[PDB]
Each structure stands twice: as structure tokens, then as C-alpha cells.
Amino acid sequence: KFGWIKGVLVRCMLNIWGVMLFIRMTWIVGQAGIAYSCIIVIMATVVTTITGCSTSAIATNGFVRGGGAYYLISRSLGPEFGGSIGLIFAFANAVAVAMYVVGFAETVVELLMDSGLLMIDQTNDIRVIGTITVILLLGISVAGMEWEAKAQIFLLVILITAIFNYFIGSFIAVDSKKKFGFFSYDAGILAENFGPDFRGQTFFSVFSIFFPAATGILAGANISGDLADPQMAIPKGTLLAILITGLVYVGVAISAGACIVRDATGIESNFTLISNCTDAACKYGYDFSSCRPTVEGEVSSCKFGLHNDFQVMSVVSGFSPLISAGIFSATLSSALASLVSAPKVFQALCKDNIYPGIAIFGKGYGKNNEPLRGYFLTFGIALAFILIAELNVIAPIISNFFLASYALINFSVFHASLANSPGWRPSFKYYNMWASLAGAILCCVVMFIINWWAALLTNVIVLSLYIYVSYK
Amino acid sequence: KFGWIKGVLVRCMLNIWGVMLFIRMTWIVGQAGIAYSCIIVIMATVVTTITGCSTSAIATNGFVRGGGAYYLISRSLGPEFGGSIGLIFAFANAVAVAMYVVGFAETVVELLMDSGLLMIDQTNDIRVIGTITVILLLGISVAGMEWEAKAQIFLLVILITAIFNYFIGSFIAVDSKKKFGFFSYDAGILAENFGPDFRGQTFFSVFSIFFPAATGILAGANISGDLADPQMAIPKGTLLAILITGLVYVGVAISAGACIVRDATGIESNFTLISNCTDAACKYGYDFSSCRPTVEGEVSSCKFGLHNDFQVMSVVSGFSPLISAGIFSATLSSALASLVSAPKVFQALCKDNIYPGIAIFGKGYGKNNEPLRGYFLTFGIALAFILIAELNVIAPIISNFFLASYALINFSVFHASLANSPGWRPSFKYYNMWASLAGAILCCVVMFIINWWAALLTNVIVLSLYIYVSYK
Structure with a gap:
């Protein structure tokens, strides 16, 4: 059905x-430096590029028939790595649904607190808004699959216009947009933001919050039967979309670092508008001292800038409330693409009976065999993780499970190309199995640097599932 | 052919x-509580008891003739697990030689600092004494193998005389032995020490310095050709010596906590002998306040007690300088038993050619085919760790590698009894493969709790050495 642009690249x-x-993004260029945000984006692009090469080698190992990213992995490689990846990835998307709707609810709550609508506290309004938007996304996943492929191009032309709106707002200079940060492209602010601050966080804890912005590269491989030719659509879409999103992340990092200060008092200075006595840097005025804390703790007695407000891309963009309200489009589109792909891999795993007490989640109800017990278990896991209503503590879990799945793929293709499996002939031009080994080692090492006990628990679960399906 | 007592139990x-x-040990009961020291000894005894059951299942899987240490593991299980255990264990003993001679050199250096002999600073006299005692122990390992099996019983009666001397000195009470700690058996100091302090260290960092006191349980399974019947000597000796040493460690920990204060200044107090007011503990006098630090750091302005002097078992003992000089016997006997067993496993691994650039260290010289290249490589690996002249930083490495080896054994027997290998008939009464799985998961978790990056490095080395030998 689909080609390669509308089927793999857009998805x-x-x-x-x-x-x-x-x-x-701006909180990452506020915590880490520009030279560290670039290293963060380049590392999370190297990881996803190696995993994209490793899944394109699976998608070019024959097997045109059969939809699902579980099917290509369990057919090209063994059923052990297939079952392990089809459980870890179907848990990673089920918790990524919770991450995207927590980000959406946080955006809605931080929009309504600027207005008069504030019912309960900030960490309890996200638990209310995030609960409603995950039962409205469950209904649109079980009764609105025919409009999703029609509305994906509308969501993409919302999203690209939002990014271009942010950029063409970043080139202009508005003095009313000052006191929230956002002066013009200044080499003083560019030199000040060049270099880390790490207020509260650290490197490989800013990377852990970044890395779910690089995940989702298996959205092309998750639909194989929907495509026309999976030998030419899945590499050419994935390894182009990864490069495009990496360049957009690098450009957004440099644009947010080169024109926004790290802290900014939320009060306009019309008395003494130009202040240069005892100046340090970034002085068009406004006297942005006394917001940087004297103590080295996590506290910062400010409300805007790159470090505090979480939402400064609204005031940098030319028109925030509708055009830069493509936050809603991005979060709901990613949660929709992770809500129809977490039971799909799970239904494909429960049909081929591998795990004992799991085959009840395979009865696909409805007309198109949509798995309702898979959708309800994904909804249960998602609603179990919405209740921790803070994105900065959900994201080191999504990063952990997606690094586990992307280490398992890059290790399974290396083990297949090293053990010389009979049905593993990787007809792809740039595969180079030692690069997939280096990618798997890098994913495991970064997953352990982020959070060592969760990484140890996830690797013990992966080894237990592998030694179970091996000696089944 | 030895029996089972003087060949397995004594070794x-x-x-x-x-x-x-x-x-x-007294520093362990000073840092941790009495209850936490008992939990530490019971956890290490559980780990070594599960590994003793798992090596008794290997030593009772036939294979009487052609005995060895690498031989039993490589011939009952596969060569893939044997060729990795025979490197991790042969590196663990090669670095344990450095640990035992660093402890011996530290004992000699502190005995010379109690006297007037002092050449250079304290962390450089250990680098001098530790280098001389590792080139003298190398000569004994290549020349004096005939005297070793006849002097082991003499070293054992020296060691048991030292333990009984410590105990019968602990029951008596000497007024002159006060101000170094060591009041008599009383419930006040027992209630004071029942509870953790953790000055500088933490739990699973006092356990890491403890756990090399439990290692060495494969000294019975390292000489199988020197035994009459390995089916009855190795299970009945290992799991008896582990119980005996666990009871001795529990008794020494309780007898060190129940009569020694944690802090005691070396100043004798004749004037104002017995205090009356402002007293919390120590109802005999000497006013041992103001040695506890007001700050919460690792610094302590004291010189004796359980926390500081490191040698208070000389003070508690009846006659220190020759009867409680079995420290030298224990350290040199353990370094000798780890110096003749690190190349022995390595020679047995290099004879069956597995690794490419390793086969040079198999040229056994001498009259009894003792590998001088393996002895020189073990001497080099030990000399690369004697130069780090601090035992509290050597011991979390020995603990890491021995937990890796004892996780690999307890996982190899579980993988053999789960895979149902054709040559794995574990004729042993108390094997129970899920206990070996629990004792492998526990070692893999504790090895990561102690030091996560060294555990990740060791597990990556183990997985590399398993995927190299197995799937090639």
C-alpha cells in the first residue's frame, strides 16, 4: 500500500x-552546554544510526510477507531474540505512551496555570489531565485507525511549520520578548552558554532525558505488510529520518543556546533600561544577577530562562499559542504511534505461543482483529506510569528500556552474523557487523551509566527470557 | 594421594x-554493627555454600582420573564456560596473591612503626616490603613445592593457636590493655556496638572488604589428581571448611564487638579515674569522648579502638608478638596457595589451545612441568597491584573477580542442569539447581552493588570470552 516517503519516512x-x-530541548542546552548538547545529540544519533542499520539488515533479509517488527526479527533471527525483543520493545512503547501523554498533560497544565484555570496542585493536575487524555487515546486507537494514516501528514505539516516558526522567530529580535531570556543572536550569550552548568543534573542524566527524543526509529519496521517493498523502504526511510531529526535537534540546540540566557528575572526593567555597571556578560540591560544561586544546590530562585520555565520555545517562536502549540500534535502523534504498536508486537508475540501465562492477550476482537486485551494491558501500564506525574523521572525509564531493545537488536544481528545462522544473509550495503557490536556495547554501557540497578534488572530479565525461550 | 582431611579440609x-x-575483622565490627557484621558473614557464607554445592556437583560428575581444577569444569560442562572460568579464576588468584602479600606487608610495616624502624613513608614501605615478599614467594612456588604439603599442617596449627590465643585473651581482663579499647565482656559495649556507625564506608563496601575472607573454597577442587576419591573428598571437605570458617568469623566478630569500644585514645588516666557525671557509655572510666568526630566525615582524631588501629587483635590476645603472629602464617599460606594455583589453572587452560595469543604461556619448564611463564605472568599481574599499597582498595577488586567466578560456576551448573547436557549427571545429595540459580543471581547482584562499572567491565569480558569460544 504505502510507498517509502508516506509509509516509513513520515512515520x-x-x-x-x-x-x-x-x-x-532548551532545558538541555541550559543544563548541559552547547558543546555538550551537541555531544548528546551526536551520541544519541550514533546509537540510533547503528540500530537503524541493524534493523535494515533484518528488513533486507528476505521475508517480504508478514507485518510487524516482531515478525522480521523472529523470522530472520531465532525465536529467543525475537521473544526477548518483542517483550522489551512492547513494554518500552507501553511506557512511552505514558511519557508522551505526561508531556502533553504537562504542556496543558503549564498553559492553564498562566490563565485562571488551576483546580489542584501542579503535580495533581497532570494526574487528572493525563488520565483523561489516555482514555481518549485508547478509544481513538480502537475506533479511529482509518483516520490515522490520513491525519499523519496533517500532523507532520503542523510539526514542520512549528519548527520553522520557532526558527524564524529565533532570527528576529523583539525587545518585549526580553526579560524571559531571548536576546538576538549574540556571540556573548553563545560564549556564555558554551560550556556546562549542570544545575541539579549531570551528564548521562541530561542524556537520559534527551534520548527518548531519538527513539521511535522502528516505526517503519513495525509496519511491513502495510508497505510495498520492505527491502527499499525501511533502510531509505529510517536512515534518512534519523539524519533529518538529528540535524533538526542540532539546529534547535545551537539556536536555543546562541540567543537565550540561562536565567532571567520575570520583571521588566523600564527604570534603568540600560545597565552596564559591574557587568559580566550578556548585558543589553535587565540586570540578570541575583537569579543564579550563590549555593551550588539544585535550587534556582528564578522563573524563566533556559533553566527554570521548561517552555521558553513559546516566547522564542513568532506565534506561540497555535503554531508553537504543535507540542500537542507531536505528543499525541507519538503516543498514538506508540499505542497502536505496543499491543501489535504483543499480539504478534502472543499468537506464536511462547510464554505460558500470556496467551490470553491474543484474542483480537473487532473486525480488523484489533487486540483489545493488549490495548487494555498497554493502557494499564501507561496509567500506572502516568501517576508519577513528572517527565524528568519518567524519561530515565523510557531511555533504559529503549536502550535495552536497541542493544538487543544490535547484539542479535551481530550474533547472527558471527554464528553464521542458515537463514541470515544480510543483503544490505552498509551493515558491518562489528559496528553493530560496538553499538550494542555502547547501548549497554550507556544504559548502565544512566541507572545501574534498573539496567541490571532489565538485563537480568532479558537473560532470563533468553534462557527460557532457548531451553523451552 | 592425600585423604580428605589433610588434602581438602586443611587446604x-x-x-x-x-x-x-x-x-x-575488628574494623568491620567497628564500621558496621554486630548485627550487620553477622549479616555480612551469613551472606558471604550463603554465597560460598551455594558455590560449594555447585562445585561438589562438578566434582561428583564422574571424571576421577586426570584430575585438576580447569579439568572438572571443562570436561563436565562445556569448554565455553570452562575457558572463561579458567581465566576469571586464574586472574582472581593472581590478584589475590597481591592482596595477601599487601596485607602481610602492611602487618610488617605497622609492626616496624610500633618500633623505631622507618625507612620511607607508610604507603611506600608497603611498596618495598610487598615487593620483596612476592619475589621470595615466587622462589618458594618454583623450588619448595615439596615442603608445602608438609608445612601446611604446621601453618594450620599456628593459625588455630592464634585464634584460640585471641579467644582466651578475650575472656580475661587486663587493666593495662585498657586505653587501647578492650574492656572485659560486658553488655554495655555489646549494646553500644550493636548498631552501625559506617565512618567513611557503607554496607556493601564493608562487605566488599570482608568477602575475600570467604574466598578460597576451590582449594579442594584445585588438586583432584592429588586425591584418593574426589567423589567423597571434595563435597565433604569444602562444605565443612566453609561452615567451620563461618562459625569462627561469627565468633570473632561477636568477641570483637562485645568487648572493644569503637574509639579509644592512647592516653592512660590515673587522675580522675572513674567518671560520675556526663557519661553515656564506658562505665569504667578513661573518658573516651571527643575522639568521635563532630563532623560526619571519615576523619577521626584518635589512634586505637575498633575504628583506627587495625591491629587490636594483638592487644586482645594473651601473647601477641609470636602467638598472634599467625597473621604472617595466614597471609603467606594463602598467597602460596593462590600463587601455585593461578598458573596451574592457566597452564591447564593454555594446553588445550583455546585463545590465540595465550598459548605461549604453556611451556612448562622445570622437572615437574611447572609453568615458569605462567609464574612470571602471575608475578607481573600481582606486582601491578602491590604498588597500590592500600588493602581497602585492593579488596573490592578481589571481591569483584571472585564474585564473577562464583557467579559463573553457579550459573554453569544451572545451565547444565537446565539444558540437560549429555554428560551432566549431577550425582550429589544437596545440589538443587534453583539454589545454584539463586546463588548466581545473588553474586551477580552483589558484584554490581559493590562496584557497578568494574562489574559491568567483568561481565562484558565474561560475555566476550563466552561468545568467542561458543559461537564461532
Whole structure:
């Protein structure tokens, strides 16, 4: 049905561009430096590029028939790595649904607190808004699959116009947009933001919050039967969408670092508008001292800038409330693409009976065999993780499970190309199995640097599932 | 052909009773509580008991003739697990030689600092004494193998005389032995020490310095050709020596906590002997306040007690300088039993050619085919760790590698009894493969709790050495 642009490239660019593009890129260039945000984006692009090569080698190992990213992995490689990846990835998308709707609810709550609508506290309005938007997304996943492929191009032309709106707002200079940060492209602010601050966080804890902005590269491989030719659509879409989103992340990082200060008092200075006595840097005025804390703690007695407000891409963009309100489009599109692909892999795993007490989640109800017990279990896991209503503590879990799945893929293709499996002839031009080994080692090492006990628990679960399906 | 007592039980009780019995047990009951020291000894005894059951299942899987240490593991299980255990264990003993001679050199250096002999600073006299005692132990390992099996019983009666001397000195009460700690058995100091302090260290960092006191349980399974029947000597000796040394460690920990204060200044107090007011503990006098630090750091302005002097088992003992000088016997006997067993496993691994650039170290010289290249490589690996002249930073490495080896054994027997290997008939009464799975998961978790990056490095080395030998 689909080609390669509308089927793989648009779906990967909608699954990748999620929460951290708008509401957490500027906080990453505020915590880490520009030279560290570039290293963060280049590392999370190297990881996803190696995993994209490794899944294109699976998608070019024959097997045109059969939809689902579980099917290509369990047919090309063994059923052990297939079952392990089809459980870890179907848990990673089920918790990524919670991440994207927590980011959406946080955006809605931080829009309504600027207005008069504030019912309960900030960490309890997200638990209310995030609950309603996950039962409205469950209904649109079980009764609105025919409009999703029609509305994906509308969501993409919302999203690309939102990014271009942010950029063409970043080139202009408005003095009313000052006191929230956002002076013009200044080499003083560019030199000040060049270099880390790490207020509260650290490197490989800013990377852990970044890395779910790089996940979603298996949105092309998850639909194989929907495509026309999976030998030419899945590499050419994934390894192009990864490059496009990496360049957009690098450009957004440099644009947010080169024109926004790290802290800014939310009060206009019309008395003494030009202040240069005892000046340090970035002085068009406004006297942005006394917001940087004297103590080295996590506290910062300010309300705007790159460090505090979480939402400064609204005031940098030319028109915030509708055009830069493509935060909603990105979050709901990524949560929709992760809500119809977490039971899909799970239904494909429960049909081929592998795990004992799991085959009850395979009865696909409805007309198109949509798995309702898979949808309800994904909804249960998602609603179990919405209740921790803070994106900065959901994201080191999504990063952990997606690094586990992307280490398992890059290790399974290396083990297949090393053990010389009979049905593993990887007819792809740039595969180079030692690069997939280096990618798997890098994913495991970064997953352990982020959070060592969760990484140890996830690797013990992966080894237990592998030694179970091996000696079944 | 030895029996089962003087070939397995004596060798295991000499390899297990190493450094941490005399010079680092009172510091463990000073850092942790009495209850936490008992939990530490019981956890290490559980780990070594599960590994003793798992190596008894290997030593009772036939294979009487052609005995060895690498031989039983490589011939009952596969060569893939044997060729990795025979490198991790042969590196663990090669670095344990450095640990035992660093403990011996530290004992010699502190005995010379109690006298007037002092050449250079304290962290450089250990680098001098530790280098001389590792080139003298190399000559004994290549020349004096005939005297070793006849002097092991003499070293054992020295060691048991030292333990009984410590105990019968602990029951008596001497007024002159006060101000170094060591009041008599009383419930006040027992209630004071029942509870953690953790000055500088933490739990699973006091356990990491403890756990080399439990290692050495494979000294019975390292000489199988030197035994009459390995089916009855190795299970009945290992799991008896582990119980004996665990009861001795529990008794020494309780007898060190129930009569020694945690802090005691070396100033005798004749004037104002017995205090009346402002007293919390120590109802005999000497006013041991103001040695506890007001700050919460690792610094302590004191010189004796349980926390500081490192040698208080000389003070508690009846006659220190020759009877409680079994520290030298324990350290040199354990370093000798780890110096003749690190190339022995390595020679047995290099004869069956597995690794490409390793086969040079198999040229056994001498009259009894003792590998001088393996001895020189073990001497080099030990000399690369003697230069780090601090036992509290050597011991979390020995603990890491021995937990890796004891996780690999307890996982190899579980993988053999789960895969139902054709040559794995574990004729042993108390094997129960899920207990070996629990004792492998527990070692893999504790090895990561101690030091996560070294555990990740060791697990990546183990997985590399398993995927290299297995799937090639």
C-alpha cells in the first residue's frame, strides 16, 4: 500500500519528534552546554544510526510477507531474540505512551496555570489531565485507525511549520520578548552558554532525558505488510529520518543556546533600561544577577530562562499559542504511534505461543482483529506510569528500556552474523557487523551509566527470557 | 594421594582464613554493627555454600582420573564456560596473591612503626616490603613445592593457636590493655556496638572488604589428581571448611564487638579515674569522648579502638608478638596457595589451545612441568597491584573477580542442569539447581552493588570470552 516517503519516512519523523523537541530541548542546552548538547545529540544519533542499520539488515533479509517488527526479527533471527525483543520493545512503547501523554498533560497544565484555570496542585493536575487524555487515546486507537494514516501528514505539516516558526522567530529580535531570556543572536550569550552548568543534573542524566527524543526509529519496521517493498523502504526511510531529526535537534540546540540566557528575572526593567555597571556578560540591560544561586544546590530562585520555565520555545517562536502549540500534535502523534504498536508486537508475540501465562492477550476482537486485551494491558501500564506525574523521572525509564531493545537488536544481528545462522544473509550495503557490536556495547554501557540497578534488572530479565525461550 | 582431611579440609581452611580474619575483622565490627557484621558473614557464607554445592556437583560428575581444577569444569560442562572460568579464576588468584602479600606487608610495616624502624613513608614501605615478599614467594612456588604439603599442617596449627590465643585473651581482663579499647565482656559495649556507625564506608563496601575472607573454597577442587576419591573428598571437605570458617568469623566478630569500644585514645588516666557525671557509655572510666568526630566525615582524631588501629587483635590476645603472629602464617599460606594455583589453572587452560595469543604461556619448564611463564605472568599481574599499597582498595577488586567466578560456576551448573547436557549427571545429595540459580543471581547482584562499572567491565569480558569460544 504505502510507498517509502508516506509509509516509513513520515512515520519515523512523527515517532521520533516527540516530547523533548519543544518542552525539553532548551532545558538541555541550559543544563548541559552547547558543546555538550551537541555531544548528546551526536551520541544519541550514533546509537540510533547503528540500530537503524541493524534493523535494515533484518528488513533486507528476505521475508517480504508478514507485518510487524516482531515478525522480521523472529523470522530472520531465532525465536529467543525475537521473544526477548518483542517483550522489551512492547513494554518500552507501553511506557512511552505514558511519557508522551505526561508531556502533553504537562504542556496543558503549564498553559492553564498562566490563565485562571488551576483546580489542584501542579503535580495533581497532570494526574487528572493525563488520565483523561489516555482514555481518549485508547478509544481513538480502537475506533479511529482509518483516520490515522490520513491525519499523519496533517500532523507532520503542523510539526514542520512549528519548527520553522520557532526558527524564524529565533532570527528576529523583539525587545518585549526580553526579560524571559531571548536576546538576538549574540556571540556573548553563545560564549556564555558554551560550556556546562549542570544545575541539579549531570551528564548521562541530561542524556537520559534527551534520548527518548531519538527513539521511535522502528516505526517503519513495525509496519511491513502495510508497505510495498520492505527491502527499499525501511533502510531509505529510517536512515534518512534519523539524519533529518538529528540535524533538526542540532539546529534547535545551537539556536536555543546562541540567543537565550540561562536565567532571567520575570520583571521588566523600564527604570534603568540600560545597565552596564559591574557587568559580566550578556548585558543589553535587565540586570540578570541575583537569579543564579550563590549555593551550588539544585535550587534556582528564578522563573524563566533556559533553566527554570521548561517552555521558553513559546516566547522564542513568532506565534506561540497555535503554531508553537504543535507540542500537542507531536505528543499525541507519538503516543498514538506508540499505542497502536505496543499491543501489535504483543499480539504478534502472543499468537506464536511462547510464554505460558500470556496467551490470553491474543484474542483480537473487532473486525480488523484489533487486540483489545493488549490495548487494555498497554493502557494499564501507561496509567500506572502516568501517576508519577513528572517527565524528568519518567524519561530515565523510557531511555533504559529503549536502550535495552536497541542493544538487543544490535547484539542479535551481530550474533547472527558471527554464528553464521542458515537463514541470515544480510543483503544490505552498509551493515558491518562489528559496528553493530560496538553499538550494542555502547547501548549497554550507556544504559548502565544512566541507572545501574534498573539496567541490571532489565538485563537480568532479558537473560532470563533468553534462557527460557532457548531451553523451552 | 592425600585423604580428605589433610588434602581438602586443611587446604580449604588455609586458603579461606586469609587476611581479613586478624587485621580487618575488628574494623568491620567497628564500621558496621554486630548485627550487620553477622549479616555480612551469613551472606558471604550463603554465597560460598551455594558455590560449594555447585562445585561438589562438578566434582561428583564422574571424571576421577586426570584430575585438576580447569579439568572438572571443562570436561563436565562445556569448554565455553570452562575457558572463561579458567581465566576469571586464574586472574582472581593472581590478584589475590597481591592482596595477601599487601596485607602481610602492611602487618610488617605497622609492626616496624610500633618500633623505631622507618625507612620511607607508610604507603611506600608497603611498596618495598610487598615487593620483596612476592619475589621470595615466587622462589618458594618454583623450588619448595615439596615442603608445602608438609608445612601446611604446621601453618594450620599456628593459625588455630592464634585464634584460640585471641579467644582466651578475650575472656580475661587486663587493666593495662585498657586505653587501647578492650574492656572485659560486658553488655554495655555489646549494646553500644550493636548498631552501625559506617565512618567513611557503607554496607556493601564493608562487605566488599570482608568477602575475600570467604574466598578460597576451590582449594579442594584445585588438586583432584592429588586425591584418593574426589567423589567423597571434595563435597565433604569444602562444605565443612566453609561452615567451620563461618562459625569462627561469627565468633570473632561477636568477641570483637562485645568487648572493644569503637574509639579509644592512647592516653592512660590515673587522675580522675572513674567518671560520675556526663557519661553515656564506658562505665569504667578513661573518658573516651571527643575522639568521635563532630563532623560526619571519615576523619577521626584518635589512634586505637575498633575504628583506627587495625591491629587490636594483638592487644586482645594473651601473647601477641609470636602467638598472634599467625597473621604472617595466614597471609603467606594463602598467597602460596593462590600463587601455585593461578598458573596451574592457566597452564591447564593454555594446553588445550583455546585463545590465540595465550598459548605461549604453556611451556612448562622445570622437572615437574611447572609453568615458569605462567609464574612470571602471575608475578607481573600481582606486582601491578602491590604498588597500590592500600588493602581497602585492593579488596573490592578481589571481591569483584571472585564474585564473577562464583557467579559463573553457579550459573554453569544451572545451565547444565537446565539444558540437560549429555554428560551432566549431577550425582550429589544437596545440589538443587534453583539454589545454584539463586546463588548466581545473588553474586551477580552483589558484584554490581559493590562496584557497578568494574562489574559491568567483568561481565562484558565474561560475555566476550563466552561468545568467542561458543559461537564461532
